[PDB]
Amino acid sequence: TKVKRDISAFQKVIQDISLAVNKFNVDIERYVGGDASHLLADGNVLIKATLDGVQSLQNEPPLSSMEALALVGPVQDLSNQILLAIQNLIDKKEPLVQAGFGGKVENNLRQQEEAAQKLSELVSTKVPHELADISRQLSDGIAAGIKKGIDAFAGTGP
Numbered sequence: 001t002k003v004k005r006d007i008s009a010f011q012k013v014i015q016d017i018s019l020a021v022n023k024f025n026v027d028i029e030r031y032v033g034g035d036a037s038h039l040l041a042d043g044n045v046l047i048k049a050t051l052d053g054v055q056s057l058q059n060e061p062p063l064s065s066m067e068a069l070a071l072v073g074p075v076q077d078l079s080n081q082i083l084l085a086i087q088n089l090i091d092k093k094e095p096l097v098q099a100g101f102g103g104k105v106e107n108n109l110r111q112q113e114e115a116a117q118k119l120s121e122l123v124s125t126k127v128p129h130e131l132a133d134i135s136r137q138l139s140d141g142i143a144a145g146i147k148k149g150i151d152a153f154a155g156t157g158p
């Protein structure tokens, strides 16, 4: 159909989360040690964007296969960026722990986990059946990644 649904609410959520994840990746990749308060702030922006997506999308009708198809690439890219973020964070465990931030990072990751779960549960109600398996796999990959981050930092605080 040439009729285009206003899917701007979905696009906005993807964009807001992407901006937060990308900013975190910029800062983590250049982090080599020292105070990590800015990284925790980046994490907080990401949690707030995630929670905002739950609030923005709660009442949106489910996506058709055609509507979902236009969001597939954007979602896949965002999944890739989130998995990069988690791996980048784990890669910087040593300077983070040296700086006395390991517990703070653990705490932030536990909040990321809870927010991601809320959004994932909501997204599962909006995706059409044709994309349900692939969406669940992308969601599970994110959830499992966050947990690997939690495992990496668990108990490393002062």
Ligand SMILES: CCCCC/C=C\C/C=C\C/C=C\C/C=C\CCCC(=O)O
Residues within 6 Å of the ligand: 010, 013, 014, 017, 053, 063, 068, 071, 072, 075, 076, 078, 079, 082, 120, 123, 124, 126, 127, 131, 134, 135, 136, 138, 139, 142
């Ligand atoms: C495979 C694409 C399915 C259609 C997409 C439907 C809704 C996505 C819209 C908003 C959710 C916001 C961000 C998604 C973040 C990470 C990857 C989600 C994986 C998934 O759970 O999809």
Ligand SMILES: CCCCC/C=C\C/C=C\C/C=C\C/C=C\CCCC(=O)O
Residues within 6 Å of the ligand: 017, 021, 024, 039, 040, 042, 043, 046, 050, 082, 085, 086, 089, 104, 105, 108, 109, 112, 115, 116, 117, 119, 120, 121, 123, 124, 138, 139, 140, 142, 146
């Ligand atoms: C100081 C710690 C900062 C860590 C920040 C780095 C990574 C956090 C990882 C994941 C959270 C990011 C985005 C959540 C996006 C969508 C929720 C899943 C929706 C779905 O799947 O449908």
